[PDB]
Ligand binder design. Structure first.
Ligand SMILES: CN1C(=O)c2ccccc2NC(=O)[C@@H]1Cc1ccccc1
Ligand SMILES: CN1C(=O)c2ccccc2NC(=O)[C@@H]1Cc1ccccc1
Ligand SMILES: O=C(O)CCC(=O)C(=O)O
Ligand SMILES: O=C(O)CCC(=O)C(=O)O
Ligand code: NI
Ligand code: NI
Lengths: 288, 288
């Protein structure tokens, strides 16, 4: 059966979104450089090691869906310099997102998370994202343009044996989900820095870790229209960190007003006709 | 033709949402007491007088849709004690909203605004709300439960001659909008404190001010599911003001995490499995 289309981030930039819209998935080879992956991993390392189980009883908002052998750490801007600078300002990410969301308007990060799966982590059930946070998305018309997309960036090797992601190609256009079976999937085999890009309608799942030794890690970046509420908050991020970012990165983290694509757009998160950034006199690119 | 159903806030509380869902509109008599209206008006008075035209060239996010004889002031929590305490904690408002949005989950304020229309303000064109800020809503299925509702609270008398709101009853279920005509409307005649409640699909418009002397004022409260981004931001509201509010009011203004109605909800605006309010140790009901 047909494999997931593979595209260069360097040469095939304009082909990436059209490919995903047609097939429901694409692999962006070298989405992040090996340098950025190294720094990213180094910076988040301790935070994933201290992370408790998804549904730990200490948590206000426990995640009862993810397996107990999953560690997910979000709100990465205060943790990681590589994330807040390099990936939040990724030229490739921003071309794809503007390609994807131009019908709606501004987009932002719904969640940037590092996921690490312990050895022998079981396969996830096949699913579409967004159904445990945004019930609204299920009420969208079948042909409505995708309101969110997910970059699953490999931070270690994705192999068949260590639980590389499964996708069902074309499943983003499925209405009837009775064809849903692991029999219909193909794998996202990836080197560190490659990204699997899917939509909120692409049926997919984490793979079974079968070696019993390897630890698979990924950076999942759910980008979505600014009209939908993020899964994570950057409200508690220190102001010196926010003010070190570019204006674009600030907007992505909810530290700016937003705009819809409506011809006479009246805006989102505004303050009596003025933006957040003006009202709070928020500075940008102030180094730490 | 059939007039807008009128309901008591005291006796008919459970009938209000069912009435709106059937007819697209209802008048809630004495939604706010005359005392609350007085305090509200007194507190916002100067802020509406200093408010420039909707599309003033000083503005970052000008509103090019509203007439030049309209003054709209939003982000009312820092301006008005009556708003932040009395209306944000309105028992009637919260019963109606939980009735309306239970399929989706938590709801919050998309915009709380005082609108004041100058004498001889023209009638607005018939419209549905949300189309200049949330293009996503037009892509919802026809029978999807309303994702936002609008309380248009009279802060002065609404009469036929001074531009009382027009609605088309049943128009919230319309797909074909060729029957749209001022011929099909009825008026929301209201005393101060009464509220016209409509959905995001109800076709309506501000009326023509024909006396040339009267100034009509209203408080419009767009309540919507927490999965949709507010039109206004409370990010710049002083922390002592936020900490004076109830936990419920804090959530309504985006100063708390939110929950969807999904059985294993994973939450909105969370921080590594914990809420905003915990992470920032946000206090509540600390008087000023
Ligand atoms: C539940 N869930 C997450 O927690 C998650 C994690 C990372 C990025 C996106 C994301 N969004 C989701 O909707 C998923 C869906 C899911 C996960 C496992 C098993 C079944 C369904
Ligand atoms: C544009 N517009 C607002 O500005 C507005 C004002 C108050 C509360 C809600 C609200 N939302 C809206 O979508 C309206 C829609 C509109 C207004 C006038 C003429 C045509 C359409
Ligand atoms: O583990 C993976 O590769 C996919 C994870 C995923 O799809 C999810 O958690 O939503
Ligand atoms: O003026 C009114 O009564 C209605 C105003 C309105 O519908 C709007 O501005 O969206
Ligand atoms: Ni997933
Ligand atoms: Ni309106």
């Amino acid at each position: 059966k047909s494999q997931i289309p593979r595209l260069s981030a360097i040469n095939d930039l304009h082909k990436i979104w059209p490919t995903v819209e047609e097939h429901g998935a694409a692999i962006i080879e070298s989405f992040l450089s090996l340098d950025i992956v190294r720094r990213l991993n180094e910076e988040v390392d301790p935070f994933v090691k201290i992370e408790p189980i998804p549904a730990a009883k200490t948590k206000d908002h426990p995640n009862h869906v993810l397996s107990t052998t999953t560690r997910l750490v979000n709100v990465l801007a205060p943790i990681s310099k590589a994330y807040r600078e390099d990936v939040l300002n990724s030229k490739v990410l921003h071309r794809i997102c503007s390609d994807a969301f131009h019908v709606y308007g501004d987009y932002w990060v719904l969640m940037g998370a590092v996921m690490e799966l312990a050895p022998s982590n079981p396969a996830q059930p096949l699913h579409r994202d967004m159904r445990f946070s945004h019930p609204i998305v299920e009420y969208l018309k079948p042909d409505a343009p995708a309101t969110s997309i997910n970059f699953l960036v490999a931070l270690s090797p994705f192999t068949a044996e260590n639980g590389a992601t499964h996708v069902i190609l074309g499943s983003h256009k499925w209405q009837n989900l009775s064809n849903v079976s692991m029999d219909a999937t193909v794998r996202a085999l990836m080197n560190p820095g490659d990204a699997l890009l899917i939509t909120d309608s692409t049926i997919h799942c984490g793979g079974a870790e079968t070696t019993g030794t390897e630890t698979r890690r990924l950076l999942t970046i759910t980008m979505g229209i600014s009209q939908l509420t993020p899964l994570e908050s950057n409200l508690a991020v220190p102001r010196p960190v926010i003010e070190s970012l570019t204006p674009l990165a600030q907007r992505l983290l909810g530290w700016a007003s937003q705009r819809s694509a409506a011809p006479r757009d009246i805006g989102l998160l505004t303050i009596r006709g003025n933006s957040i950034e003006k009202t709070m006199n928020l500075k940008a690119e102030q180094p730490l």
